[PDB]
Design a protein around this ligand. Structure first.
Ligand SMILES: C=CCOc1cc(C(=O)O)c(O)c(I)c1-n1cccc1
Ligand SMILES: [Zn+2]
Length: 197
C-alpha cells in the first residue's frame, strides 16, 4: 500500500510553515515555495512550523513519514542506506534505520509499522510558547538523497499528519525533500529549471 499525500486542513485548519533562509552557499536548510521542496544538509536541523486555526484536543499528535515521490517506487519503504544504518550515530531513541528523526524532544516515538514496515516519528502536540503564534518541530534527515543502496537519487516526500490519540487522521500536509551537500545552490538551480520551463 501507499500512504495518502492529499493536503487536508481538517477541522483545525492544520498546515505547515517554513522559515525564509535564503540560498547562500552556507545555508544548511532552505525551503522553496515554488517547488514545495525543502533542501537540507545531512543531519542538520530542519525547522518545520505547525499552524492551526483552532486548538486541537489534548492528546493530538504530529507524525512525519517519508515516501518515494515517483509512482514506480512508492511502495518501497524509505529507509537509511546500508552504510548509514550501520554508522552508530544513534541519539538513544531513533532506530538506526529511520531516515527522519525529531531533534530535542524526549517524547518523540518511533514506529516500525507492523503491517507496512514503514517508519515514522510522532510527537505530542504542544501549544505555542507565550509570544509565539505557531509551534516548531525540528527534524533531521539522516541520509543523502544520493546514498547508494538507499534513496539512490530518488526524490522523496515528507508527509506530516495531525492525528488524534487513536491515530485517526485530523489533518495532512506534505513537501518534497532533497538532502544534499549544497542546499542553497541546488535550490537556485531547481528554481531556475522551473523557470525556463
Ligand atoms: C494539544 C495541543 C495543542 O496543539 C496546538 C495548540 C495551538 C493553540 O493555539 O492552542 C496551536 O497554535 C498549535 I500550532 C498546536 N499544535 C502543536 C502541534 C500541532 C498543533
Ligand atoms: Zn546514507
Amino acid at each position: 500500500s501507499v500512504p495518502s499525500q492529499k493536503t487536508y486542513q481538517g477541522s483545525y485548519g492544520f498546515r505547515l510553515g517554513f522559515l525564509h533562509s535564503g540560498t547562500a552557499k552556507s545555508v544548511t536548510c532552505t525551503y522553496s515555495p515554488a517547488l514545495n521542496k525543502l533542501f537540507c544538509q545531512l543531519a542538520k536541523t530542519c525547522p518545520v512550523q505547525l499552524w492551526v486555526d483552532s486548538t486541537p484536543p489534548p492528546g493530538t499528535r504530529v507524525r512525519a513519514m517519508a515516501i518515494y515521490k515517483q509512482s514506480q517506487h512508492m511502495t518501497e519503504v524509505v529507509r537509511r542506506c546500508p552504510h548509514h544504518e550501520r554508522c552508530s550515530d544513534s541519539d538513544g531513541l531513533a532506530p538506526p534505520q529511520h531516515l527522519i528523526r525529531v531533534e530535542g524532544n524526549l517524547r518523540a516515538e518511533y514506529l516500525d509499522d507492523r503491517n507496512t514496515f514503514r517508519h515514522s516519528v510522532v510527537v505530542p502536540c504542544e501549544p505555542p510558547e507565550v509570544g509565539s503564534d505557531c509551534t516548531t518541530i525540528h527534524y533531521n534527515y539522516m541520509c543523502y538523497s544520493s546514498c547508494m543502496g538507499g534513496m539512490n537519487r530518488r526524490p522523496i516526500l515528507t508527509i506530516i499528519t495531525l492525528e488524534d490519540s487513536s491515530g485517526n487522521l485530523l489533518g495532512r500536509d506534505s513537501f518534497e525533500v532533497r538532502v544534499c551537500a549544497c542546499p542553497g545552490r541546488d535550490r537556485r538551480t531547481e528554481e531556475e529549471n522551473l523557470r525556463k520551463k
